[PDB]
Amino acid sequence: GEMFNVPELIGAQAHAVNVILDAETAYPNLIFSDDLKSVRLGNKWERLPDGPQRFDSCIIVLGSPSFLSGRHYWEVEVGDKTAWILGACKTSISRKGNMTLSPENGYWVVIMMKENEYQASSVPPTRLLIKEPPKRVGIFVDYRVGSISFYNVTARSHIYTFASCSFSGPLQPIFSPGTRDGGKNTAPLTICPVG
């Protein structure tokens, strides 16, 4: 079974790890809290110093630590935002250009596109039939079994699992606060301790 190893929310939360944002990877208009738990999208003139490590096209930032084995869980406040990206990726993803955010390309993510539109970034994408919009999302990686699972912490329910994943090399958390959406989506993502 695809889900035999996949825990419920409480079981996932037992594997909580401390994640921080790696601001040096960030798309240069992203803005970070001093504690490296929050990220939001600034204006075009608000720029971090450029470098080869930064994403240049996709509004993305990576987290730390990376991991090569084991079970790892973290939780993110998404609140009343209208768009975001959450999940994990290979540490070796390319930073420059546009690339599809797919398992084959080293990404395992769920995307909020707009109100009431959520997808798993399979190819083709899979619509997620969410009825209670999450205000906090949990991400659980089980390296050995090759799964990454997403939870609606608000509803205390599973959202989606990528199973039979092709994990090689280290993985790390990935985040996007989305575009500003005319002012509807300016709030940060905030990594949070399990409640």
Curated annotation (Swiss-Prot):
Self-association and partners: Homotrimer. Interacts (via the B box-type zinc finger) with PSTPIP1. Interacts (via the B30.2/SPRY domain) with several components of the inflammasome complex, including CASP1 p20 and p10 subunits, CASP5, PYCARD, NLRP1, NLRP2 and NLRP3, as well as with unprocessed IL1B; this interaction may lead to autophagic degradation of these proteins. Component of the AIM2 PANoptosome complex, a multiprotein complex that drives inflammatory cell death (PANoptosis). Interacts with NFKBIA and RELA. Interacts weakly with VASP and ACTR3.
All copies of domain B30.2/SPRY, residue ranges: 2-194
Induction: In monocytes, up-regulated by treatment with colchicine and IFN-alpha, by the pro-inflammatory cytokines IFNG/IFN-gamma and TNF, by bacterial lipopolysaccharides (LPS) and by retroviral infection. Repressed in monocytes by the anti-inflammatory cytokines IL10/interleukin-10, TGFB1 and IL4/interleukin-4. In neutrophils and macrophages, up-regulated by IFNG/IFN-gamma with a peak after 8 hours of treatment.
Function of the protein: Involved in the regulation of innate immunity and the inflammatory response in response to IFNG/IFN-gamma. Organizes autophagic machinery by serving as a platform for the assembly of ULK1, Beclin 1/BECN1, ATG16L1, and ATG8 family members and recognizes specific autophagy targets, thus coordinating target recognition with assembly of the autophagic apparatus and initiation of autophagy. Acts as an autophagy receptor for the degradation of several inflammasome components, including CASP1, NLRP1 and NLRP3, hence preventing excessive IL1B- and IL18-mediated inflammation.
Disease per UniProt entry: Familial Mediterranean fever, autosomal recessive: A hereditary periodic fever syndrome characterized by recurrent episodic fever, serosal inflammation and pain in the abdomen, chest or joints. It is frequently complicated by reactive amyloidosis, which leads to renal failure and can be prophylactically treated with colchicine.
Post-translational events: Cleaved by CASP1. The N-terminal cleavage product localizes to the nucleus as a filamentous network and to the cytoplasm, interacts more strongly with RELA and NFKBIA than the full-length protein, enhances the nuclear localization of RELA and induces NFKBIA proteolysis. The C-terminal cleavage product localizes to the cytoplasm.
Documented effect of changing residue 113 to I: In ARFMF and ADFMF; no effect on PYCARD/ASC inflammasome formation; no effect on interaction with 14-3-3 proteins
Name of this protein: Pyrin
Native species: Homo sapiens
Effect after changing residue 10 to T: In ARFMF; likely benign
Part of the full-length chain shown: 583 to 776 of 781
Source organism, top-level taxon: Eukaryota
Result of changing residue 163 to S: In ARFMF; uncertain significance
Domains as described in the record: The B box-type zinc finger interacts, possibly intramolecularly, with the pyrin domain; this may be an autoinhibitory mechanism released by PSTPIP1 binding.
Tissue occurrence: Expressed in peripheral blood leukocytes, particularly in mature granulocytes and to a lesser extent in monocytes but not in lymphocytes. Detected in spleen, lung and muscle, probably as a result of leukocyte infiltration in these tissues. Not expressed in thymus, prostate, testis, ovary, small intestine, colon, heart, brain, placenta, liver, kidney, pancreas. Expression detected in several myeloid leukemic, colon cancer, and prostate cancer cell lines.
